């Protein structure tokens, strides 16, 4: 469950949010391979509501009409081609699992779907799975509305619908096994794991019944013996009665206070400031990391439309979150989830975002190709953050210093430190409203880094900073807060 089945070397997933499954195999192709990514976390490819008011909204793709791997992604053929494609290449597929529930009770009976499939929420009625009025939570739910009411009520939050969505009866063994039987379909693909949609809704072990039920990964790419990577979507802050320890036995679990902390710190919130780092992980009341799937942002965070509310950092702040990013790449914490994003038309009124439904670039309806410029950018409104210099740089960064330890801390009292890793690599942050120059202790060996934030290393020359560390170990890093990027990172790979 606890493995991610990556490539040995590769220590990070890019959530390559909305793509077209043919965009996705070239990207395994042309750059995630060749840069260093062990994985894509993708959209749900089992087929779902078409929303027409608003106009195909992203959160339309949570909402299941059938298991059918039928959607605007691409279809079935499609989605083989893009995961023995990126299989082929050493790129994992881990898919968006929805199975705590169907559509939105009030969604019009038709045929009003992604792949023609009928349904009828109205009477539970779900012929292409098939689903019935016996597979649904209605009679368990005992709200006077049947919806969520109360989170401080484990049970109703299990047993009701979230807002409307029909809830599955996740305990009867037909319900485990239809939804079994759709995984274990894309086990036999070759998807290296699940990230499992809404688990705070689901009991942790009707969840573990599930999972029992799953084939070890396809023999023809993985070791036999292999179990599918497991993490859970569990939005776990304040004291609240459903507590993300309760999952540890299926697998990992999403600790969104990361990003929601880390977000404070950096935008310097109520007196936070990054020296406050200097003990960041389980010292902070995370859960364990090896339990751990950690980001800066998600698709459902980027938003103002989640957990974290307005502290979370994404690409609309591009200088704070390049930083953001680069801490959470440097340091040993979890395993990290990459964002990768579209631009929607942010539209802020009474301090929140009417466009937040927006989903994702199109024609009509027909999600944009991703077009990559000659500067190695996207173009039709993809963002691909995973392609900025900075942030590519720092999963390289990642899997050169994996395994090495936590190492010479160093802070201002204020927001200016630096850590490395190991022998390996090292890290320094300029947060403060002055300039920072030091001469740190940095542990790597003698010798001249290119530093990856703001250059390359081109065959025997750095096309940014450089950085000359002594035979001590000693290096001398200046850094003004009026720099494009505030940080300086260099690693074993990036000397000269
Ligand atoms: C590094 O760049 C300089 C020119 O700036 C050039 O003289 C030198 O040959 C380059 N070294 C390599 C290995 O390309
Ligand atoms: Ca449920």
């Not at 082929?88 to 009770?105: F, P, S, T």
């Not at 929601?260 to 200097?278: D, F, H, P, Q």
């Not at 999600?367 to 900075?390: A, F, Y």
Request: glycine share 10%; charged share 20%; with cysteine.
């Amino acid at each position: 469950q606890y493995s991610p089945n990556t490539q040995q070397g590769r220590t990070s997933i890019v959530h390559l949010f909305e793509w077209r499954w043919v965009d996705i195999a070239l990207e395994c192709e042309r750059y995630l391979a060749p840069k260093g990514f062990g994985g894509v976390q993708v959209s749900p490819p089992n087929e779902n509501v078409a929303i027409y008011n608003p106009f195909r909204p992203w959160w339309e793709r949570y909402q299941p009409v059938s298991y059918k791997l039928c959607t605007r992604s691409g279809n079935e053929d499609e989605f083989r081609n893009m995961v023995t494609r990126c299989n082929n290449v050493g790129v994992r597929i881990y898919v968006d699992a929805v199975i705590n529930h169907m559509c939105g009770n009030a969604v019009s009976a038709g045929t009003s779907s992604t792949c023609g499939s009928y349904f009828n929420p109205g009477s539970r009625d779900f012929p292409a799975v098939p689903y019935s009025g016996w597979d649904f939570n209605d009679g368990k739910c005992k709200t006077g509305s049947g919806d969520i009411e109360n989170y401080n009520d484990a049970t109703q939050v299990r047993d009701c619908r979230l807002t409307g969505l029909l809830d599955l009866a996740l305990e009867k063994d037909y319900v485990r096994s239809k939804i079994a039987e759709y995984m274990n379909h894309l086990i036999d693909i070759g998807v290296a794991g699940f990230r499992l949609d809404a688990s705070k809704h689901m009991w942790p072990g009707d969840i573990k019944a599930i999972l029992d039920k799953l084939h070890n990964l396809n023999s023809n790419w993985f070791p036999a013996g292999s179990k599918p990577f497991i993490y859970q979507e569990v939005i776990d802050l304040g004291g609240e009665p459903i507590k993300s320890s309760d999952y540890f036995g299926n697998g990992r679990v999403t600790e969104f206070k990361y990003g929601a902390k880390l977000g404070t710190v950096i935008r310097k919130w109520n007196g936070e400031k990054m020296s406050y780092l200097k003990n960041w992980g389980e010292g902070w009341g995370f859960v364990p990391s090896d339990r751990a799937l950690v980001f800066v942002d998600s698709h459902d965070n980027q938003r103002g439309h989640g957990a974290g509310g307005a502290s979370i950092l994404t690409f609309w702040d591009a200088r704070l979150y390049k930083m953001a990013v680069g801490f959470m790449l440097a340091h040993p914490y979890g395993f990290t989830r990459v964002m990768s994003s579209y631009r929607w038309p942010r539209q802020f009124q009474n301090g929140n975002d009417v466009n937040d439904w927006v989903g994702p670039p199109n024609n009509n309806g027909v999600i944009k190709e991703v077009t990559i410029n000659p500067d190695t950018t996207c173009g039709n409104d993809w963002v691909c953050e995973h392609r900025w210099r900075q942030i590519r740089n720092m999963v390289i960064f990642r899997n050169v210093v994996d395994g090495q330890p936590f190492t010479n801390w160093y802070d201002n009292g204020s927001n200016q430190v630096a850590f490395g890793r190991g022998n390996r690599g090292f890290i320094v942050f300029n947060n403060d409203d002055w300039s920072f120059s030091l001469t740190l202790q940095t542990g790597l060996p003698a010798g001249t880094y290119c530093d990856v934030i703001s250059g390359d290393k081109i065959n025997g020359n750095c096309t940014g900073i450089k950085i000359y560390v002594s035979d001590d170990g000693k290096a001398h890093f200046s850094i003004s807060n009026s720099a494009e990027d505030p940080f300086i990172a260099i690693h074993a790979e990036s000397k000269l």
